[PDB]
Amino acid sequence: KRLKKRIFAAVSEGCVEELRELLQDLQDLCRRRRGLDVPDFLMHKLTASDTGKTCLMKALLNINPNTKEIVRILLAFAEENDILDRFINAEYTEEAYEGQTALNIAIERRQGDIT
Amino acid sequence: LQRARTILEFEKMLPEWLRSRFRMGELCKVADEDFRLCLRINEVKWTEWKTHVSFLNEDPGPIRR
């Protein structure tokens, strides 16, 4: 089940009801796998491996008039598993233009509301 | 204009297979299917700040990798 491809295309198009179903299913399989990696598995599903981009970096590149809601739902889910400090303070590490965190997109996209 | 009159003359008197590519070739347009129409690249500068809606890639500057 390509859950990573569904959550990237859901946040790109701007649909919020599609996200919460992907948000519910990823919490569900997190309840199924709780052996040794409750923080590490939830991070690796939201974050890719080549770029290192999260679902929040992809949330802020593409802007659309649902994007205030699409962050507020998505921050509370990283708060629900106590991983928001690793989540929000995650750095782009593709080593060509690395270091650009989730905050660095927000000021550049001149969204003074959600910053 | 006067050096434009010569370049289109030398290019017309060059009957090779034209290996000299002047352009990004077959780079994608915005469509589900229409990947054609080879392209060009230029640059813009400071004024008129706005949120950027229409874009093609997730902010690289060269080709990725």
From Swiss-Prot, chain B:
Cellular localisation: Cell membrane; Cytoplasm; Lysosome
Disulfide bond entries: none
Superkingdom classification of source: Eukaryota
UniProt note on tissues of expression: Expressed in keratinocytes and hair follicles.
Cytoplasmic-side positions: 1-65
Summary of subunit composition and partner proteins: Homotetramer. May convert from a homotetramer to a homopentamer to allow pore dilation. Interacts with TRPV1; may form a heteromeric channel with TRPV1. Interacts with SNX11; this interaction promotes TRPV3 trafficking from the cell membrane to lysosome for degradation.
Known role: Non-selective calcium permeant cation channel. It is activated by innocuous (warm) temperatures and shows an increased response at noxious temperatures greater than 39 degrees Celsius. Activation exhibits an outward rectification. The channel pore can dilate to provide permeability to larger cations. May associate with TRPV1 and may modulate its activity. Is a negative regulator of hair growth and cycling: TRPV3-coupled signaling suppresses keratinocyte proliferation in hair follicles and induces apoptosis and premature hair follicle regression (catagen).
Family label: Belongs to the transient receptor (TC 1.A.4) family. TrpV subfamily. TRPV3 sub-subfamily.
Protein's name in the database: Transient receptor potential cation channel subfamily V member 3
Organism for this UniProt entry: Mus musculus
Gene (UniProt): Trpv3
Residues included from the entire protein: 694 to 758 of 791
